Amino acid sequence: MAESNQVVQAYNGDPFVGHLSTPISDSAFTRTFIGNLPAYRKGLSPILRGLEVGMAHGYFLIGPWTLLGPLRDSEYQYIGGLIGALALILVATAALSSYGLVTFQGEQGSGDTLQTADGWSQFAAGFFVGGMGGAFVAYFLLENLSVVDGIFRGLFN
Amino acid sequence: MDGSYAASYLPWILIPMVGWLFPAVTMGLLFIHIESEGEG
Amino acid sequence: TKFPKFSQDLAQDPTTRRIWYGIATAHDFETHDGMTEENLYQKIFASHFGHIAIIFLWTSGTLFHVAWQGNFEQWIKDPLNIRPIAHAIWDPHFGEGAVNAFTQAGASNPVNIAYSGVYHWFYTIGMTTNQELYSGAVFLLVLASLFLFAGWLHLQPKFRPSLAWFKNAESRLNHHLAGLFGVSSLAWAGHLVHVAIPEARGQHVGWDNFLSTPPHPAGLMPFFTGNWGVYAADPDTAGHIFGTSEGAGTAILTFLGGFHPQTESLWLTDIAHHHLAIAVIFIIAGHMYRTNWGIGHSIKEILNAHKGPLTGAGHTNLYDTINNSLHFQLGLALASLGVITSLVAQHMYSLPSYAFIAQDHTTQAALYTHHQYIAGFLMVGAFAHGAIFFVRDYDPVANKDNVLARMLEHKEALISHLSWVSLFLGFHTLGLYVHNDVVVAFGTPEKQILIEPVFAQWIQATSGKALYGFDVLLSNPDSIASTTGAAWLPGWLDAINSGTNSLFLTIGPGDFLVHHAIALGLHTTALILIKGALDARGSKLMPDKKDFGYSFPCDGPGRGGTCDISAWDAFYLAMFWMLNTLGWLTFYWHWKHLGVWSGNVAQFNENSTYLMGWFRDYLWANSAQLINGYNPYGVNNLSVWAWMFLFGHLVWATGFMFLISWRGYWQELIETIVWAHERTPLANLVRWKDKPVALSIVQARLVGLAHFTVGYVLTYAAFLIASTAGKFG
Amino acid sequence: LAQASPTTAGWSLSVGIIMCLCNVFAFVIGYFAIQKTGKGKDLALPQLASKKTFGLPELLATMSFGHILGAGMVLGLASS
Amino acid sequence: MALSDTQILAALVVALLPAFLAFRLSTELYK
Ligand code: CLA
Ligand code: CLA
Ligand code: CLA
Ligand code: CLA
Ligand code: CLA
Ligand code: CLA
Ligand code: CLA
Ligand SMILES: CCCCCCCCCCCCCCCC(=O)OC[C@H](COP(=O)(O)OC[C@@H](O)CO)OC(=O)CCCCCCCCCCCCCCC
Ligand SMILES: CC1=C(/C=C/C(C)=C\C=C\C(C)=C\C=C\C=C(C)\C=C/C=C(C)/C=C/C2=C(C)C(=O)CCC2(C)C)C(C)(C)CCC1
Ligand SMILES: CC1=C(/C=C/C(C)=C/C=C/C(C)=C/C=C/C=C(C)/C=C/C=C(C)/C=C/C2=C(C)CCCC2(C)C)C(C)(C)CCC1
Ligand SMILES: CC1=C(/C=C/C(C)=C/C=C/C(C)=C/C=C/C=C(C)/C=C/C=C(C)/C=C/C2=C(C)CCCC2(C)C)C(C)(C)CCC1
Ligand code: SF4
Ligand SMILES: [Ca+2]
Ligand SMILES: [Mg+2]
């Protein structure tokens, strides 16, 4: 009740922190949704976080080159997409690992097991395995798109 | 299984989405919710 | 744990029961923790908005799938020879045979045919294209959005309605009669006169032109003057052909009764006139009660002023009794709505309003069965919430000596006389049926006790049915009831005296016997429900039952044993009798109309007297096609109905398990299973978050009844649909 | 020629049945809706019932509004 | 005439509005 029908408030109750509590920044839905993504989900080991993020990213990264790459109008369309996505995930893993190497040179913190050298390295390992796996399974599903189509239509029974 | 109606590629992916993904996700959310032991 | 947040008791339950009960008590807002009355009404208001929105979205889905995957525009051309399709099938399980079997009704892909009568409805009210249905569905998307947003907004503090706003019965009655019922019926008469009736005459009227094309060539001039008869005008001729101007009239408001000769349904001008008259009456009635201008009635004063020397306190304080009990209000709404839902069922099959729907026999059977089952559920719920009222809300001191309390005062008389009428009916109806069965078995069917239903035949005669020759009222031309010059009398008589429709179907001894079966069923279901409601506060086995709530397991094995003591148990028992009653009435309807449509009325007339005729000529025979939906030789479009028939048998028999075998045996078995898990290595790595336990006693009753009812309804639906569709009436 | 059909000076239907009726309607909703009815520069004294009830500006404005309403309604009821 | 692909896809976008409003009403009724 009262007089505050207002939907925007000071972020975390401190009006002098440069941020605002808004329906996009700090609603219950965004808190629960962002807070349960692999990056923030409570209790997860960084290996599983990396694995999940890599699965999602490797899976979806096959598409752009698959439909729009230079081999899209060749007999090696899906292989071209796969090669592109694999090389991209390799470069991304190198970027993640270089980041971990440079930002965790000093004393290791304690609150965030992902924000350590060991944790960020585990995240990179999981991300590599998940990205390569997701890219290869997206490629495998696309390369056998006819059997997936017949499966979804019942063309085999 | 086919369809001559408009945009007949929609059941193709919506039937798996309604039968597999929607129930899996909603049951998983409700499962983690009813088991949540946060005080209150 | 958090779930459920509205009950600390359930939240601290360490067993799986916590889950079940959390699901089972969600909507019982009154027993949530910390619930106040105002918050109760506000939550109910917002839930109501959500429910209306769900209804609108459902209707949108119906419109959308007919417009997208149906054959509406084709069905409009040849509505008697084309089967309306509901939506497309997409099932990766189908084989070639089923794919072939379900590319039907002219479709180029697997499809189901619709039995909701929705094609006839949309076509009668003036819609002719898929674009119109799609626009309707998008509009209903928007309407549902509006009601959803309103529901959200009325949970906001500034827009939260006060308790006194919810308790203003006079203003709400005024608005619902004059506006919700009255202006809606007026607007519908306007749609009929503006769109549906012109569309039925070959004219197009839509948003592109409805401003510049009047419904009548005279237009409003006769209305605001005298001269109202101009609108009764020249009606559609007997040769009028629906959708064209051949034989079409110009009138917009008629009263000629009977049915349209080609479409076998009520005349659209009669329907428009009906809605205009109903609008007038409802608008007038919506001024009865006092609001903001002194004039108007106080319901409280009316109720208090109605006392007699033989009813004690009369209706004193009934205004507060009803205005403070949401369960009293809900029971009243449920009973009244169930009565008029049965009324809808009885009148739509007899006096249909949608063009050509009478010749669509599967839709007629399905809609009748649908509305009758809805009515049965509504009636049972009405009595259940009356019991809940007596348990939770009834006040003896304020209701003291009035009619409400006096009903409790002589409850033993009521319950005993209900028992007596049920015994009377059961004993003698079963006795006549069994006499007829034995007498026909031994090869002497002439010794059947065949009672002619003279009273219902005489009533049919009073309305004009001359077949029996009673010559009473409308069956006698000399009658003052028939010498009035009523404009509807020629059409009404022409319709009711042709044996070509379902307007007062001819009846005989079979109808007598099934009507007494129906009376037995109604009386026994009412007896169970009323005994439960009147003993819910207390009996001699439980003189303190009101302290134990509406629903509880029992009172233990002491005092003789107290299984099924709660009024909830009375509801649960009455559900079986409601389902039995509806089985009898739908068997009657379906078999009689099977004879009517087939032309062979003699089968029902001569074999509905003994129950073996019901067994073989109705149930056993009409399964032949249904049961051959799939066989070692192939598959046809009845395969779904055969598999659903079996599915319903299975679900019903499965509910038998929960009903017959009670709980302790299962808890011991679950304890053996718990030990088996805790001692099996590898599986020992995993443990349950909730302790597994057997379902509770009440939970068992409810789950068994749910399986019983699902199987009941699905079995009979598959049978009805498949038999009427394979035979085609 | 494809032109929306109006009406010649009916002076039975066009007048009171529409124009004066719309003017009376504007009278009513202005009477019940104008915040400052008689706060005009011009008193235009003898406060009456409706024709010249509260103030000269109330009268003039509600009458201009009634003429807008009546023009719209006459034109609409005569096709467009 | 037959509905178009554009009409089918346009109705899904429109249905996104009742979806969001039903989510809002649900989560508020949870309070
Ligand atoms: C019983 C009363 C009555 C009746 C039934 C009619 C009947 C009619 N009127 Mg009329 N009208 C009335 C009263 C009435 N009017 C009154 C009291 C007024 C005074 C305000 C008007 C003034 C009025 C005007 C100015 C016009 C009509 C027009 C019309 C015709 C409209 C056809 C159409 O579909 O429009 C069109 C349908 C649309 C969907 C167009 C809407 C799209 C617009 C362009 C969106 C613009 C948004 C805008 C910028 C936002 C507003 C800004 C801000 C103030 C919010 C129609 C036959 C039109 C006409 O005569 O046609 C020849 C016309 O020009 N009426
Ligand atoms: C330049 C932008 C771009 C491009 C051109 C593509 C291109 C493509 N995408 Mg991608 N996408 C993009 C951006 C892009 N995407 C972005 C920004 C996202 C969000 C991060 C996605 C996320 C996305 C997903 C999630 C998917 C695609 C898929 C696809 C392919 C589907 C087309 C096809 O071949 O049909 C054929 C499509 C299929 C055969 C999909 C199979 C059916 C799936 C499995 C749905 C069934 C759900 C079911 C519940 C799963 C069962 C497992 C279990 C839960 C029971 C296609 C090559 C699909 C794909 O990769 O196909 C393998 C796919 O699943 N996209
Ligand atoms: C001969 C020694 C040697 C060899 C066999 C490898 C082999 C490998 N390294 Mg490693 N690396 C080395 C030394 C070596 N490294 C040293 C000394 C460092 C510290 C600077 C690193 C730091 C490094 C990082 C941060 C990462 C790798 C990764 C990898 C794998 C990805 C493939 C690749 O990078 O191409 C083959 C590489 C070579 C033939 C040259 C090796 C020697 C140079 C100095 C390595 C420089 C690393 C560079 C920044 C990352 C390359 C980017 C990528 C796009 C190729 C691969 C199996 C990636 C991985 O997936 O790890 C799990 C990754 O994230 N390396
Ligand atoms: C409640 C109404 C309703 C119902 C019962 C159905 C039923 C069905 N639809 Mg349909 N649909 C509807 C409305 C409805 N539809 C509307 C309004 C649209 C336009 C936005 C669509 C657009 C749509 C498409 C594109 C497809 C279906 C399809 C299907 C079939 C497979 C299920 C599915 O994939 O749905 C998916 C549904 C959507 C993507 C849109 C959501 C539908 C509405 C807006 C939400 C309904 C919420 C509901 C009222 C919540 C109450 C649930 C209750 C238990 C508490 C199924 C028989 C598939 C089909 O045709 O099978 C061959 C198909 O591919 N629907
Ligand atoms: C004219 C003003 C007006 C109108 C339009 C309404 C309308 C409505 N009110 Mg409201 N109300 C009003 C004023 C009004 N109210 C005022 C002033 C108050 C304060 C005193 C209230 C306080 C109030 C409360 C507290 C509640 C409502 C509720 C409702 C809804 C009732 C449920 C429903 O949808 O059934 C619709 C009913 C009909 C369309 C008519 C009944 C039909 C009869 C029974 C038979 C059917 C006829 C015909 C054969 C049908 C054809 C079938 C078809 C398929 C072919 C309804 C839409 C309830 C609600 O749901 O809240 C959202 C509710 O909780 N009202
Ligand atoms: C129409 C208005 C209406 C309203 C709003 C209410 C409101 C209420 N009722 Mg009531 N009642 C009604 C009608 C109504 N009822 C009817 C029609 C009946 C007869 C069946 C009853 C009989 C009744 C009883 C006996 C009781 C209530 C109770 C309650 C309260 C608790 C609700 C709850 O949380 O249960 C939640 C419900 C469930 C968990 C079960 C849902 C069952 C689903 C819908 C059926 C499942 C079908 C199956 C899955 C289909 C499978 C298909 C597949 C095989 C193809 C609540 C305030 C209870 C109470 O609290 O008493 C005060 C109580 O004991 N009602
Ligand atoms: C075909 C099954 C069946 C039958 C025959 C009955 C019978 C009866 N039920 Mg019942 N019921 C049933 C199923 C059945 N129930 C089920 C599944 C449920 C859900 C659990 C219920 C729950 C239920 C409730 C809650 C109530 C009833 C009631 C009644 C009585 C109603 C009065 C009547 O029918 O008139 C007269 C009775 C009869 C026609 C039945 C007797 C028939 C015999 C054959 C008469 C001849 C006697 C015979 C020769 C004895 C000699 C035996 C010797 C040869 C060994 C009646 C005795 C109501 C009641 O008690 O009424 C007061 C009541 O309250 N039933
Ligand atoms: C189809 C068969 C129906 C079976 C029903 C059960 C049969 C058993 C007979 C019941 C006798 C009850 C004894 C009452 C005990 C009794 O005699 O009380 C005496 C009572 C006198 O009280 P007063 O009328 O003076 O009280 C003033 C009122 O304001 C308060 O009641 O007289 C009656 O109530 C007659 C009505 C009884 C009949 C009940 C109505 C049943 C049907 C109602 C139809 C409504 C139609 C409304 C249309 C406008
Ligand atoms: C200026 C004004 C007036 C002039 C009004 C004019 C000039 C036009 C008014 C037109 C009106 C008031 C149209 C109202 C339409 C209401 C509708 C359409 C309501 C509900 C529709 C529903 C609820 C859903 C229906 C469904 C749909 C969508 C389907 O497609 C399937 C069937 C069903 C499910 C029923 C007059 C002079 C008169 C009085 C003075 C003020
Ligand atoms: C709708 C929506 C949204 C969005 C979403 C998105 C954007 C997403 C996408 C999604 C995705 C993106 C998904 C995925 C999936 C994936 C997967 C499932 C994977 C995989 C992989 C695999 C399975 C692999 C395997 C392997 C390995 C690992 C190794 C060996 C090789 C192989 C291949 C075997 C949101 C909620 C936000 C909001 C609302 C709406
Ligand atoms: C428990 C309870 C309750 C109850 C419930 C219920 C459920 C009831 C009911 C009941 C019922 C369910 C009833 C019914 C009825 C009916 C009637 C009452 C009828 C009437 C009629 C008439 C009168 C008619 C007439 C006529 C004819 C016959 C024909 C021609 C025309 C005329 C109109 C003349 C309550 C809540 C309330 C309270 C608490 C407790
Ligand atoms: S058998 Fe069950 S219901 Fe009956 S008294 Fe014992 S515990 Fe209660
Ligand atoms: Ca039209
Ligand atoms: Mg009808």
**CA dist., res. C288 & res. C176, Å (int):** 12
Residue of C114, C118, C143 whose CA lies nearest to C54: C143
Residue D8 lies in domain: 1-80
Residue C112 pairs with which residues in a beta bridge?
Answer: C87
Which numeric CATH code is attached to C1-729?
Answer: 1.20.1130.10
Test mutation, A153, A156, A157, chain B, max B CBs within 10 A = A153
Alpha carbon of C709 to those of A77, C470, C519, C531: distances in Å?
56, 43, 22, 22
Domain boundaries defined on chain A: 1-157
Tokens of C505: 């179907």
Rounded Cα distance, C514 and C433, in Å = 10
Q: Are A48 and A42 in contact (CB under 8 A)?
A: no
> How is residue C629 written in tokens?
């939906």
Strands C85-88 and C630-631: unpaired
CB-CB neighbours of C581 under 10 Å:
22
Residue C492's contacts (CB-CB under 8 Å, 6 or more residues apart) are: C257, C258, C463, C464, C474
User: Is the shortest distance between the CB of C166 and ligand 5 below 6 Å?
Assistant: yes
Q: Who lines ligand 12 at CB under 6 A?
A: C 553-554, 556-557, 561-563, 662, 697
Strand partners, C631: C634
Task: Determine if residue A77 is left, alpha or beta; phi over 0 gives left, psi from -120 to 50 gives alpha, anything else beta.
Answer: alpha
Nearest CA among C253, C167, C686 for reference residue C488: C253
Domain A1-157 top-level CATH class: mainly alpha
Q: Which residues of C touch A153 (CB under 8 A)?
A: 92
* List of E strands, C389-436: none
* Cα–Cα distance measured from residue D34 to residue D17, given in angstroms and rounded to the nearest whole number: 25
Neighbour-count burial for E2-31, b at 16+ CB within 10 Å, e otherwise: ebeeebbeebeebbeebeebbebbeebbee
H/E stretch holding C384: helix C361-392
Question: Per the structure block, which two tokens stand in for C640?
Answer: 């779904």
- E strand residue ranges, C410-461: none
Task: Decide if C702 contacts C27 (C-beta within 8 A).
Answer: no
Number of domains in chain B: 1
Cβ-based contacts of C211 with chain D (< 8 Å): 76, 80
Residue C724: C-alpha distances to residues C115, C366, C595, C604, C727 (Å): 11, 10, 11, 16, 5
**Cβ(C427) to ligand 9 under 6 A?**
no
Distance (Å, rounded) from C-alpha C625 to C-alpha C727?
8
Candidates A152, A154, A155; nearest CB to B16 = A152
3-state secondary structure C628-652: CCEECCEECCCHHHHHHHHHHHHHH
| Residue A128 burial by Cβ neighbours in a 10 Å radius (0-12, 13-18, 19+) | buried
- Six-digit token string for C48: 């109501």
Of C394, C241, C373, nearest to C328 by C-alpha is C394
Q: Whose CA is nearest to atom 25 of ligand 9?
A: C136
Protein residue with least CA distance to atom 34, ligand 9: C59
Residues 684-723 of chain C whose Cβ lies under 8 A from any Cβ of chain B? 689-690
Q: How many angstroms separate the CA atoms of B25 and C442, rounded? A: 65
CA distance C313 to C405: 9
Between CA C539 and CA C531 the distance in angstroms is 10
Q: How far apart are CA A147 and CA A128, in angstroms?
A: 28
By DSSP bridging, strand C630-631 and strand C111-113 are unpaired
Ligand 2 atom nearest A148 alpha carbon: 39
Q: Does C211 touch chain D (CB under 8 A)?
A: yes
The three-state secondary structure class of C297 is: strand
> Which chain C residue is nearest to residue E17, measuring alpha carbons?
C145
Closest CA of chain C from E19, distance in Å? 8
Torsion angles phi and psi, residue A44, rounded to 5:
-65, 145
User: Ligand 11 mean position to C717 CA, how many Å?
Assistant: 29
Burial class (CB in 10 A: 0-12, 13-18, 19+), C593: buried
Q: Are C674 and C664 in contact (CB under 8 A)?
A: no
Q: Could you give the angle at the alpha carbon of C325 between the alpha carbons of C321 and C326, nearest 5°?
A: 150
SS in 3 state form for chain A? CCCCCCCCEEHHHCCCCCCEECHHHHCHHHHHHHCCCCCCCCCCCHHHHHHHHHHHHHHHHHHHHHHHCHHHHCCCHHHHHHHHHHHHHHHHHHHHHHHHHHHCCCCCCCCCCCCCHHHHHHHHHHHHHHHHHHHHHHHHHHHCHHHHHHHHHCCCC
| CA dihedral of A36, A42, A48, A51, whole degrees rounded to 10 | 30
Numbers of helices and strands, H then E, in chain B: 2, 0
Two structure tokens written together for C318:
């009934």
Handedness of CA B22, B28, B31, B37 (dihedral sign): negative
The number of beta carbons lying within 10 Å of the beta carbon of residue C447 is 12
Rounded CA separation C496/C152 (Å): 52
Q: Find out whether C85 and C69 touch, Cβ atoms under 8 Å.
A: yes
Residues C67 and C71: their CA atoms lie apart, in Å, by 8
A154 and C158 within 8 Å at the Cβ level: the answer is no
Residue to substitute from E3, E4, E20, interface C, most C β-carbons within 10 A: E3
> D7 — contact with chain C (CB < 8 Å)?
no
SS (H, E, C) C552-604: CCCCCCCCCCCCCCCHHHHHHHHHHHHHHHHHHHHHHHHHHHHHHHHCCHHHH
How far away, in angstroms, is A142 Cα from ligand 2 center?
Answer: 9
Atom nearest to C564 CA in ligand 12: 3
Cα E9 to chain centroid distance, Å, stands at: 11
Tell me: is residue C649 an annotated ligand-binding position: yes
Give the C-alpha separation, C53 to E18, whole Å. 9
Q: How far is CA A24 from each of CA A7, A122, C68, rounded to the nearest angstrom?
A: 11, 31, 36
Token representation of residue B40: 């209150």
Question: Whose Cα sits closest to atom 30 in ligand 8?
Answer: C314
Determine the distance in angstroms separating the CA of A152 from the nearest CA of chain C, rounded to an integer: 5
C-alpha C112/C-alpha C88 separation (Å) is: 7
Helix (H, G, I), strand (E, B) or coil at C691: strand
C599, C615 Cβ separation under 8 angstroms: no
Q: Give the span between the Cα atoms of B11 and A152, in whole angstroms.
A: 10
Q: Which structure tokens are listed for A37? A: 């993504």
Q: Which positions in chain C touch E31 (Cβ < 8 Å)?
A: 155
Range C200-217 burial, b when 16+ CB lie within 10 A, else e: bbebebeeeeeeeeebbe
Distance CA(C365)–CA(C81), nearest Å, equals 18
Report how far residue C372's alpha carbon sits from residue C582's, in angstroms, rounded to the nearest whole number: 7
Nearest to A132 by CA among A45, A42, A55, A70: A55
Decide if B5 and E4 are in contact by the 8 Å CB cutoff.
Answer: no
C577 annotated to bind ligand: no
Which range of residues forms the domain containing residue B8?
A: 1-40
Q: Where are the domains of chain C?
A: 1-729
Give nearest CA residue, ligand 10 atom 28. Answer: A133
Amino acid at C115: Y
Cα–Cα separations (whole angstroms), residue C142 to C9, C149, C154: 41, 11, 18
Nearest ligand to the C-alpha of residue C569? Answer: 6
Among C50, C217, C269, which Cα is nearest to C148's? Answer: C50
What value, to the nearest 5°, has the Cα angle with vertex C412 and ends C408 and C414? 80
CA atoms of C87 and C116, how far apart (whole Å): 12
Sign, CA torsion C50/C55/C56/C61: positive
* C666 marked ligand binding residue: yes
User: Residues near ligand 11 with C-beta < 6 Å?
Assistant: C 328, 331-332, 335, 339, 382-383, 386, 389-390, 533
CB C263 within 8 A of CB C356: yes
**CA angle at residue C471 from C470 to C473, to 5 degrees?**
120
**Residue E19 at interface with chain C, using a CB cutoff of 8 Å:** no
Inter-residue contact C66 to C86 (CB < 8 Å): yes
How far is it, in rounded angstroms, from Cα C626 to Cα C727? 10
The dihedral sign for the CA sequence C511, C512, C517, C518: positive
Per the CB < 8 A criterion, the answer to whether C565 and C541 are in contact is: yes
Q: Is chain A adjacent to chain C, meaning 3+ CB pairs within 8 angstroms?
A: yes
How far, in Å, CA of C55 to CA of C49, rounded? 10
Query: Please, which residues have CB within 8 angstroms of residue C574's CB and are 6 or more apart in sequence?
Result: C380, C383, C525, C528, C529, C532
Number of domains in chain D: 1
The two beta strands, C630-631 and A20-21, are unpaired
Question: Are C17 and C693 within 8 A, CB to CB?
Answer: yes
Between CA C46 and CA C43 the distance in angstroms is 5
* Pocket flag, ligand 9, residue C139 (CB < 6 Å): yes
Measured CA to CA, the distance from residue C240 to residue C237 in angstroms comes to: 5
- The neighbours of chain D, by the rule of 3 or more Cβ pairs under 8 Å, are C
Give the Cα separation of C273 and C256 in Å (integer).
11
CA pair distance C186, C105, nearest whole angstrom: 38
* C309 alpha carbon, closest ligand: 8
Give the method used.
X-ray
Q: How many CB atoms lie within 10 A of CB C524?
A: 23
CB C640 within 8 A of CB C717: no
Best probe residue, ligand 7, of C430, C516, C524 (max atoms within 8 Å of C-beta): C524
Which tokens sit at B37? 């032991």
Rounded CA gap, A15 and C654, in Å? 62
Phi, psi dihedrals of residue C15, rounded to the nearest 5°: -110, 170
Go through C289-320 and write b for each residue having 16 or more CB atoms within 10 A of its CB, e for each that does not: beeeeeeeeebbeebbeebeeeeebbbbbbbe
Integer distance in angstroms from the first to the last C-alpha of chain A?
Answer: 61
Reported residue count of chain E is: 31
Residue A114 Cβ < 6 Å to ligand 10: no
- Identify which of C275, C223, C267 has the alpha carbon closest to the alpha carbon of residue C247: C267
